[PDB]
Amino acid sequence: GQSVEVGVGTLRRQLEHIYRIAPDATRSEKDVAINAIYRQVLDVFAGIPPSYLRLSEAESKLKNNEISVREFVRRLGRSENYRKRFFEPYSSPKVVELLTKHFLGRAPISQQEISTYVQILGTKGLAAAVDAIVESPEYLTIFNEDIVPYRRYPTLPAGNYRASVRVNDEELISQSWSSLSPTYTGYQYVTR
Amino acid sequence: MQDAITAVINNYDVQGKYLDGAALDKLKAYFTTGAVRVRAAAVISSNATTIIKEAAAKALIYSDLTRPGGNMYTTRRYAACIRDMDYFLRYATYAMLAGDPSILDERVLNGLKETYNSLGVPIAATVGGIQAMKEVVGGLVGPDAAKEASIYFDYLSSGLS
Amino acid sequence: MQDAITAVINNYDVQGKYLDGAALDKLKAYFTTGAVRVRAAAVISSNATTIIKEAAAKALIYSDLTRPGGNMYTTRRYAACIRDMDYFLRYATYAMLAGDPSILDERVLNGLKETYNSLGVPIAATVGGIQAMKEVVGGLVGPDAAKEASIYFDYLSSGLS
Amino acid sequence: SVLTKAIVNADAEARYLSPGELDRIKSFVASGERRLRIAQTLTEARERIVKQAGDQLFQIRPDVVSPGGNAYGEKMTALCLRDLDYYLRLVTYGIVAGDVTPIEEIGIIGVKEMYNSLQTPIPAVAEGVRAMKNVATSLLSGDDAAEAGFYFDYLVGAMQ
Amino acid sequence: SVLTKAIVNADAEARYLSPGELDRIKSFVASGERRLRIAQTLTEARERIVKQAGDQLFQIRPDVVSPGGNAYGEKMTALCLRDLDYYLRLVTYGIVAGDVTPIEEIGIIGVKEMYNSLQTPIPAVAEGVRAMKNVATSLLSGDDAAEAGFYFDYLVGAMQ
């Protein structure tokens, strides 16, 4: 007999949290929530950047409630720190599905969409593509003005559950973003 | 991506070598052709639209491709095709400025062969669209730049076939 | 993921069994070691950085690995490597608290062997980095916890090889 | 082919062919159109399959591209991928015919003796072929990927 | 380079290079031979430069080379000058590229984390670099010394 673990897990609903923020509500709570934005959006699997890219003035804008979580996420999407590390090295087709996931938690839906975003990256560039998503109906209903985005595994579109399982939490990020000094590969071993 | 100059720097960095005579000679061979690359890019950019129109006219339209059953039938697909053409032209202009084809691999060729197989996009017909734009480009840019522009169009087209 | 308390429940649920004597004995065997797991985690967490430093010093740096041509050459890659090391240490600490290796499979090992093959990351050298952190950990946590911490480092390292 | 194999067994017995053998031929004819299509698909991506096979190989066995390795150096590596290109070609031939036949005569009978002379490590050639299976198989539908996979595993088998 | 930087901004906005971007490529390439001469001179005196930096460093911070110092001892000092040799090399790369892309990926991004682990005092590495500026700059004409100096002050800046 199959256990509770056998179908669609049980370890993934536990692992998905919804963080909101509560304007008048503690630094620590703010921090963890803020840290999760970084983890979902720029991959950061260890969940925090060695005081990197980050958000000087970005953090004060999000807290203060000057900016709302949706907005902060949109700023984060169009930035140098992001362009380099996810669009610096990829033809026009896998960068689109990667921009999709981080911000919609998935892969491209159908062949008709490999068109809407490829033409927006075609002509208006990366910044416009980021905005196209943060403002779509799908983004809005699911995480609206203030839910930090999370991984999804959604059931519905057909084929999308298995694609989603594969794009996120099954196949990680390869390829070093920078092109500066290739890794040589003839030396697996550390004998001494 | 990398250009002529960073191609050399990264090749030496992995050996941890300061640039030596052989390296310095390569970089000179790039710098000495640099002004000509710039002039050529300004011709291509400013004639972009005319190059696509003359390349399509010689190699794509007035054909079964643009007729019902053809892949560039429908205003939708005709638009997608000449959109693509603009990508090729524009990126080849980047490759030629950089003096390195690496950008054509990273941002254009990777997965494109199979993408075209999956949509049904005719590969051989697309290559002719590339080699027709090269033909036009080589006239417009002149003796100075003709060979140098040409190679990155040829890089593109053997990348698909 | 699952832990010793949770695993006992899901292992019985699939058989639709109440927890019986055999189950209750297993859970006791976990609870009875629980306080020691907590103390050990507090030592590892608070010495995290020193464990990585001493493990790298015994098993990675002062070598061809850190020299030009080596995979942990460049500040970029050196940073990525000790970043990885922190993951291993941190997750092994989770596995040991949970008393179950399932988290090491779900969130660390799955696809990692091939990821390292694809980037060129030296597997054997990474295992030594794991088994050096274990060595340090086993000193710091003491008789109480040494064997229990150790196994999840050994789980990690036979997961790559 | 399937034809050659059936016939040779028929003639050896000196009697016309009989219902079964015939059934296999009929299956092969229907299969051949699909088989021809798979070979064409494999042929289209040959350069990508070889190159990515070659990376997958040298990670898994870096020793062949090392001081005392058969494929050590730029032109000892160039010939190595060329041999990988040879075997992918033979795999397309095998698929199309429906029987392995010609590939055997072209590239396994005598292969031990050839590579022993050159001192090439045979089992790492078998690995290069597994690596090609992995790449080629990711460009084919489930059903066609299996049909192709049998011929890859044969070559892997014969180098043994 | 200047090329890489210009292009990346071009491609990211889906456009051809600006008049500005074209102008800087032109001014940059005109300074090619000069930049190559600046790198040559410094490459030619590398062994002298690191040491004079190394003397200037140990006077200013005799402690680093003291009981509880990161560079205390003969081989903890040998590695320290080797790191100074590394950064001078990267400075020659930067000068010929006309920007920091290469300098940055190779030796500043991740440098805080590396040296914090080794427990190396970062600000005294910045001093070692100032010391190299002083020596290198005394082997170059006024105009070339300034052009070089920008790249030294960048590294000093990034370790901060």
Binding site: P182, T183, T185 | - | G120 | G54, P62, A78, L81, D85 | -
Partner: peptide
């Protein structure tokens, strides 16, 4: 001939089969 296979010296975004020829080794000197 082996000309098609030859431009495979470019390897990947950054994949070179092992060991980058002569490599300076300055540790003795330091």
């Amino acid at each position: 001939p082996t000309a098609g296979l030859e431009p495979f010296v470019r390897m990947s975004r950054m994949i070179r089969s092992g060991v980058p020829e002569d490599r300076e080794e300055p540790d003795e000197l330091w």
